[PDB]
Amino acid sequence: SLASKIMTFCFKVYGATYLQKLLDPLLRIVITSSDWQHVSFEVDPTRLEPSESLEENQRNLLQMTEKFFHAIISSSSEFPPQLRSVCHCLYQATCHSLLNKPQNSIGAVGSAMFLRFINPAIVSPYEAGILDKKPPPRIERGLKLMSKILQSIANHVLFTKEEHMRPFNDFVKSNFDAARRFFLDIASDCPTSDAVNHSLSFISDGNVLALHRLLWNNQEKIGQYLSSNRDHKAVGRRPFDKMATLLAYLGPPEHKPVADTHWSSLNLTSSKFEEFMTRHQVHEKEEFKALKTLSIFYQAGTSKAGNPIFYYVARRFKTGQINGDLLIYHVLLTLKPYYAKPYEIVVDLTHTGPSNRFKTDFLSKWFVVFPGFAYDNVSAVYIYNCNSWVREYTKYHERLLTGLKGSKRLVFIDCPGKLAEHIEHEQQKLPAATLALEEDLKVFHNALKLAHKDTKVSIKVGSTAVQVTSAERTKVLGQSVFLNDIYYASEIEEICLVDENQFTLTIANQGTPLTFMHQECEAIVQSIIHIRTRWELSQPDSIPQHTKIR
Amino acid sequence: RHLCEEADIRCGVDEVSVHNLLPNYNTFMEFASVSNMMSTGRAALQKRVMALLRRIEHPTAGNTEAWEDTHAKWEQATKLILNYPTDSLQEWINMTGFLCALGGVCLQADTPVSKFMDRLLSLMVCNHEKVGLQIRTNVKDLVGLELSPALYPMLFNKLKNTISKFFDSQGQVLLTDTNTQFVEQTIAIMKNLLDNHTEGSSEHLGQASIETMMLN
Amino acid sequence: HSLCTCSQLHFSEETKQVLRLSLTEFSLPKFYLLFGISKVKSAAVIAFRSSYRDRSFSPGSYERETFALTSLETVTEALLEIMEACMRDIPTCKWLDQWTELAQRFAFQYNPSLQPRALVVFGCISKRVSHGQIKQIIRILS
Numbered sequence: 001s002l003a004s005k006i007m008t009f010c011f012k013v014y015g016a017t018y019l020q021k022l023l024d025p026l027l028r029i030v031i032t033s034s035d036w037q038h039v040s041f042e043v044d045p046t047r048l049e050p051s052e053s054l055e056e057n058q059r060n061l062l063q064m065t066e067k068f069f070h071a072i073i074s075s076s077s078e079f080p081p082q083l084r085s086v087c088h089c090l091y092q093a094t095c096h097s098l099l100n101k102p103q104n105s106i107g108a109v110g111s112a113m114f115l116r117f118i119n120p121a122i123v124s125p126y127e128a129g130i131l132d133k134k135p136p137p138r139i140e141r142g143l144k145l146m147s148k149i150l151q152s153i154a155n156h157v158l159f160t161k162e163e164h165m166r167p168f169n170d171f172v173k174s175n176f177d178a179a180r181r182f183f184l185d186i187a188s189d190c191p192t193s194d195a196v197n198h199s200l201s202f203i204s205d206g207n208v209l210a211l212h213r214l215l216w217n218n219q220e221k222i223g224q225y226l227s228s229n230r231d232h233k234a235v236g237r238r239p240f241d242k243m244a245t246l247l248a249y250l251g252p253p254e255h256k257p258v259a260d261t262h263w264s265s266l267n268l269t270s271s272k273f274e275e276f277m278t279r280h281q282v283h284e285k286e287e288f289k290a291l292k293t294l295s296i297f298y299q300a301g302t303s304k305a306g307n308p309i310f311y312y313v314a315r316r317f318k319t320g321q322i323n324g325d326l327l328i329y330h331v332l333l334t335l336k337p338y339y340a341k342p343y344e345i346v347v348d349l350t351h352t353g354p355s356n357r358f359k360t361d362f363l364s365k366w367f368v369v370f371p372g373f374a375y376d377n378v379s380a381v382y383i384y385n386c387n388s389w390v391r392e393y394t395k396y397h398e399r400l401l402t403g404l405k406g407s408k409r410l411v412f413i414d415c416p417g418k419l420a421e422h423i424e425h426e427q428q429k430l431p432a433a434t435l436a437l438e439e440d441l442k443v444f445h446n447a448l449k450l451a452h453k454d455t456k457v458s459i460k461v462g463s464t465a466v467q468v469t470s471a472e473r474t475k476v477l478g479q480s481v482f483l484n485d486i487y488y489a490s491e492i493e494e495i496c497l498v499d500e501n502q503f504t505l506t507i508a509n510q511g512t513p514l515t516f517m518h519q520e521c522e523a524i525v526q527s528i529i530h531i532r533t534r535w536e537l538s539q540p541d542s543i544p545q546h547t548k549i550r
Numbered sequence: 551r552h553l554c555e556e557a558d559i560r561c562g563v564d565e566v567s568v569h570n571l572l573p574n575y576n577t578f579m580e581f582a583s584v585s586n587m588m589s590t591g592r593a594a595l596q597k598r599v600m601a602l603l604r605r606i607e608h609p610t611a612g613n614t615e616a617w618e619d620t621h622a623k624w625e626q627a628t629k630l631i632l633n634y635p636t637d638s639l640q641e642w643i644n645m646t647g648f649l650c651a652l653g654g655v656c657l658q659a660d661t662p663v664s665k666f667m668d669r670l671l672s673l674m675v676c677n678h679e680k681v682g683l684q685i686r687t688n689v690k691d692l693v694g695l696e697l698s699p700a701l702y703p704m705l706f707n708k709l710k711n712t713i714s715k716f717f718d719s720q721g722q723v724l725l726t727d728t729n730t731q732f733v734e735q736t737i738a739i740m741k742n743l744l745d746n747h748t749e750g751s752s753e754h755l756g757q758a759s760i761e762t763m764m765l766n
Numbered sequence: 767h768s769l770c771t772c773s774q775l776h777f778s779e780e781t782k783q784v785l786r787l788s789l790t791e792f793s794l795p796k797f798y799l800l801f802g803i804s805k806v807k808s809a810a811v812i813a814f815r816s817s818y819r820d821r822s823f824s825p826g827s828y829e830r831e832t833f834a835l836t837s838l839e840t841v842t843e844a845l846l847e848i849m850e851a852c853m854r855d856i857p858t859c860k861w862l863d864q865w866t867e868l869a870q871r872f873a874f875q876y877n878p879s880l881q882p883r884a885l886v887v888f889g890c891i892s893k894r895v896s897h898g899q900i901k902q903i904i905r906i907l908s
Contacts, residue, residue: 244794245787245790245791248794
């Protein structure tokens with residue numbers, strides 16, 4: 001039902017992080033630790049193996065359950081605020097339900113929340129995406145029996161006609177009070193969060209578009225429902241009057257954009273995605289192979305710590321010309337063998353432009369497609385040759401990137417003289433075209449960018465392109481860096497020297513041209529004309545152009 | 551009801567057993583409400599019956615044996631009508647509608663569900679002088695407006711492969727009187743199939759790729 | 767529209783939002799019915815005729831809808847909403863006092879074509895009433 005789907009979205013969107021962060025450390029101990037070694041978490045006499053003592057299995061299973069049970073109770077603070085509010089409403093609903101009708105409101109809430117939110121992850125962590133590889137069946141059995149014991153604690157029900165598990169009934173008795181405290185803490189949230197306040201007030205531009213579209217489709221029917229009721233007061237100041245007026249004012253909604261990725265729904269996880277691609281024959285599509293030639297996200301030697309390095313080239317990926325899932329599979333496939341251990345990834349954003357960009361929806365998928373534990377195995381991230389456009393993009397997509405805000409793993413190369421020290425020289429394989437520039441031309445230090453605000457920029461007139469390097473640090477994701485815009489010589493369509501004090505540099509689809517002030521403008525313009533003229537000879541036919549008016 | 555109410559007595563607590571001893575407990579309750587309705591011709595009633603028969607989510611020993619047992623009768627009944635060169639048909643129609651709306655439970659190479667489709671698709675083009683028209687007029691009506699949303703991913707694959715062999719090597723169309731009659735049916739089925747918006751249909755349309763069929 | 771695009775008056779940005787919303791409402795199918803031109807897709811087209819120099823207009827369809835004094839209230843109160851919004855900005859404005867006098871003159875004078883409409887308007891806008899006025903209203907009913 002509609003009410004049901006509200007819960008599913010609430011728990012899934014926020015619960016996922018809470019469960020994985022808590023359960024993940026515990027799973028490592030049982031799955032991998034040599035101390036546990038091999039043991040059967042089985043107490044069924046029919047299936048009981050004579051080799052293993054029944055007592056040993058029973059005590060180990062009880063001990064394992066205590067480990068998980070203690071962690072859940074301890075991590076009361078880590079509960080997300082959203083779910084805390086959700087539990088309170090149910091508590092008030094049940095409490096109001098009780099009043100009109102020794103049932104405990106907390107008892108019903110605790111059993112429901114645990115059964116539908118905590119229980120599913122423990123039973124099958126692999127499906128939830130907590131673990132990349134399916135746990136061995138013997139380990140799986142212990143989790144299943146563990147859930148049943150834990151669930152009984154919430155209901156305060158002893159083992160009836162359950163002699164198989166009757167011996168364990170003693171343990172649950174002590175923890176009945178403990179379970180109550182955990183439920184009460186979440187259920188103790190104030191009905192009105194006067195104290196708990198978070199005035200984020202995010203714009204949420206993407207969501208608004210869907211809301212406006214939804215209203216337009218059902219304009220007529222939603223009006224009739226309001227018309228039937230509300231006769232007591234004139235609707236002029238009530239929804240129906242406002243809805244028609246506002247909706248007409250805005251006009252019809254704009255058409256939806258296309259989707260490069262395959263069809264996807266809320267029911268999506270790392271495990272689910274991997275199976276889908278495997279069944280699809282992406283290997284022989286002949287588009288996956290092309291990605292190999294483009295040399296996108298390629299492994300390159302190692303680092304100071306010895307972890308392998310990867311280099312992702314922004315230039316090689318077009319926004320929509322290729323399906324975005326195939327790129328995801330290639331990155332996931334290459335990282336699958338090694339992403340378990342800590343790894344370093346370097347992203348090359350040289351000459352970034354709007355042509356090569358990530359959309360809001362497609363960007364979000366990267367957070368979920370990967371299993372999730374690899375993110376914690378991100379040893380370090382290095383960004384090179386950043387430019388102003390990236391900063392503007394970051395501001396708009398801050399919400400999605402808020403997790404990376406002020407991220408320690410993010411390392412920004414403020415100047416070329418810093419990366420060479422930290423990274424292994426003679427092994428890094430940054431783009432050859434990037435290396436072709438070599439930043440080996442004259443520097444017009446202390447050139448001033450005349451604009452609404454003045455920023456000192458050092459300009460290098462390269463052999464094949466012009467690099468504008470800002471000399472004033474900028475704040476990107478909480479780390480200071482100097483912006484270095486790169487403009488290809490071919491893209492310098494117009495070069496006008498208005499005056500010896502400053503020159504004009506108009507570029508394709510950049511609106512107002514770029515003006516800078518240097519004591520020798522004619523020297524700068526002279527070289528640019530010389531550089532631009534050289535390209536004219538290189539190109540086969542420059543005369544055919546234009547025939548396009550924006 | 552009397553099959554459901556027995557569940558409550560055996561185990562008062564709902565969740566522990568009422569949804570474990572009788573997995574399809576909630577849907578069964580709906581059957582009762584329809585019974586408390588005004589009597590109407592078999593056509594009107596079959597619409598409500600086939601709707602509820604389409605909401606049986608959980609496979610069960612009863613479901614998985616009612617579907618197979620009634621399939622064998624369906625197959626043999628069909629041969630008598632065709633091979634021999636009105637009440638007999640009316641029963642045949644009911645078995646098909648039932649045997650489609652409740653297909654999803656028996657889902658999961660050669661399998662009883664798959665073999666149902668093959669025989670079903672080989673009846674859309676049934677040219678029988680005596681009663682041929684009525685068979686095609688109704689198989690189109692059912693497979694379109696009544697198929698279970700859990701069988702869309704299998705309908706398209708067989709419907710697509712049937713089309714793919716209409717083109718010989720080097721992509722040359724093979725005009726045939728029957729092949730032209732088959733496409734005329736595939737258009738009416740797809741139109742009705744896509745037109746209807748029901749619960750759960752959306753999630754299942756995603757699995758299959760309708761592109762290659764449309765282009766051909 | 768002329769109010770929104772006039773330079774003599776200086777309406778704050780709050781007032782101008784009221785005017786622009788009113789501009790949108792009057793083009794809704796709700797107000798086409800009040801004015802009595804329902805079943806007309808656009809008002810502009812009917813108002814103007816292209817071949818108005820060559821030939822004279824040829825009226826027809828003498829069948830004429832009726833008018834209800836309850837419709838006039840909806841119109842008379844929508845306009846009063848616009849006028850007061852402006853008077854908040856314009857200091858010591860006299861618009862409402864001039865309109866009331868004009869309505870008050872036709873209300874209490876025998877004219878079977880204007881008196882009914884000039885009464886539904888006198889009450890919808892006026893802000894004060896005295897005993898002497900009420901006696902006249904109840905004696906027009908008598």
